[model samples]
Target: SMLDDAKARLRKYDIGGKYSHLPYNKYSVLLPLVAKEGKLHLLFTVRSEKLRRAPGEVCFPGGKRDPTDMDDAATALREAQEEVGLRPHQVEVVCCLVPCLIDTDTLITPFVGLIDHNFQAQPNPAEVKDVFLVPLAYFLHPQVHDQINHIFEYTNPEDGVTYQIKGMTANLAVLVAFIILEKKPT
Candidate 1:
């Protein structure tokens, strides 16, 4: 199974504590995966337009870590739950991928996890304006690079609105797709 294969390969690439000593505002994002129509889809949330930082950007469920959070995985789960009503127990965390520095002062950790396909999201309007899913295969297309305007973009068929998936969000999507599909984008 592709999911099983992804789990095994992701474990090998996990950089658990290598970046812990870095002096930066640490954050974690959950790359939530769901199996639909025999294919895996990645879940993303559009930030509420009312929010101050990067409002309306398409990103995975995540945010800055709280003092009480036990670890990166815990922070990811808690943020996912707070932003999308995804309970902590519903997620089967696969592994933590390489962490990336964002905005010169913030470090973002990406965690890959599997979720139930039927679980509908209850987005917190204060933080998330919308929730959507993109098939993992979509990122593997050959024209992905040419399609970027310095920032990856996708037009939602249902809403007819173009959303930008850039920075860490864009990088992680491509990385995860390549890892699971075992194919490089042409």
Candidate 2:
């Protein structure tokens, strides 16, 4: 009964809600792993600080676009392969979401995908300290998400905007209101 209430609330914040707009283009993918149990898990990597970039940070398995990339989607797949040893051809993209920019001047596109259950990884030790997965359901839990009433004073200036986010990297599933994972009739 309690779960039902939570689901109802999260449903309110999804799909049609508004988010801010900014300039400069970047891209990231919502990489999902299909476990042997058939459950879906989101993949992330903890980077080693030794590397030059945003090292030692937790982020999705993706990076910026390369000149060779035909489009943002192709770039997302290539980056995943380069960072996480995930082959570009092994995954299927479900969809793409709105572009978001941060205070640091970046416009990021977020893609969502599901990998086959028998996926094999050959992670690079230099960049990735660990490749890991978190159950999709855990992040969807209403009580476990981070939320704030933020003022976008930088990047694309906004009067103010409240952000509710879940999963390992704060960029997993961005929403304007609280997200709840409610069990549907089964």
Candidate 3:
């Protein structure tokens, strides 16, 4: 039921073609969702340390649009496959949320998609160092608002390391959580 409700709302609020005229470097990200134990979870990736930009940071599975990519959604799907081994056909793409302008030079289109709960990620070591999931409702907790200057911490279950989630990644998580859960952090 939550997935159905989220799909309807996402389709309604999707900002399609509103920012097409913006002359900026285009990127797309897939906000992967999974239904685990009757609750929804958001999947994220830890960037490989070898990357030049934002090494070891947490982010969604996505990257710049490739020349062969047909559209924003296609770019997101392609990147998701390359980075996390999530095939395009395996995802049930819901809708694109409002585009985000970052660094005044790049525009990122975030596409929400549902993946099979049993899907196992085979992360590419060159692009993705690790993969993890967080309950969508965790972002809506009031404790997140009282954290260290908007930074949220999540521990990796496979390993005992804690990762700091902040910046655009954290903002997007909160936004998506609020939209799907219809609740705000108090």
Candidate 4:
């Protein structure tokens, strides 16, 4: 589902330089791994309404790069700590995706990461309302991945720089690739 959504969003990109050449903010993901119900679990969060951008939306544990944050990776890690109670040293950075810029100003940089199976999370109540998991079993099927989509307006005729917006659901592309690559994601 995520792959389809991502591909769809890729199409809306109206600028250039890989889709919209649309400038965008970047962030990362420290995908969680746990042995639960005889399978691996992928953790995600539903952001609170207090957030400025995608308030009350389902997203990975991350945030915008702050001036005080050392780098994009630092910003992502730090945000994970503050928002979801993820410790700074708890996760191992595996790798990162290319900067996916769907607009003229926001670039999202997703980092695949690994954490201990027994790590604990303490979500900041003000920022995150809930944490959820999309079972690898359900996420790898094209049928399941087909159930959702993310539509973003990465360009417009008037604005010099297009803004990015998105609608999403369980993304199977990442999960499937991870599964194929390692037989696991944790």
Taken over the whole model, the C-alpha lDDT of each candidate is 0.85, 0.55, 0.86, 0.55
Judge candidate 1 at residue 64 and give its lDDT. 90
Worst 10-residue lDDT window for candidate 3 reads 141-150
Residue 93 lDDT, candidate 2, scale 0-100:
66
Best by TM-score: 3
Q: Which model is ahead, 1 or 4, in terms of lDDT?
A: 1
Q: Compute the lDDT of residue 113 as modeled in candidate 2.
A: 59
The best-first sequence of candidates by lDDT reads 3, 1, 2, 4
| Per-candidate TM-score against the hidden true structure | 0.88, 0.66, 0.90, 0.63
Alpha-carbon lDDT of model 4:
0.55
Q: How many steric clashes between backbone atoms does each model show?
A: 0, 0, 0, 15
Candidate 3: list runs displaced more than 4 Å: 142-148, 156-160, 183-186
Could you list the CA RMSD of all candidates, in the order they appear?
2.9, 10.5, 2.9, 12.1
> Where does model 4 exceed 4 Å of error?
1-24, 35-38, 142-169, 172-186
Tens-digit per-residue lDDT, 1-186, candidate 3: 767877876787688767855778999999999888788889999999999999999999999987898788999999999999998778998888888888889999999998976689999999999998888888887234345477888765668688778888888888888888884233
For TM-score, candidate 1 versus 2, the one ahead is 1
**Ranking 1 against 4 by TM-score, winner:** 1
C-alpha positional error of residue 75 in candidate 3 after TM-score superposition, expressed in Å: 0.7
Summarize candidate 1's per-residue lDDT along 54-147 as a digit string, tens digits: 8888889999999989887899999999999999778899888988876889898889998976688999999999998888888877234354
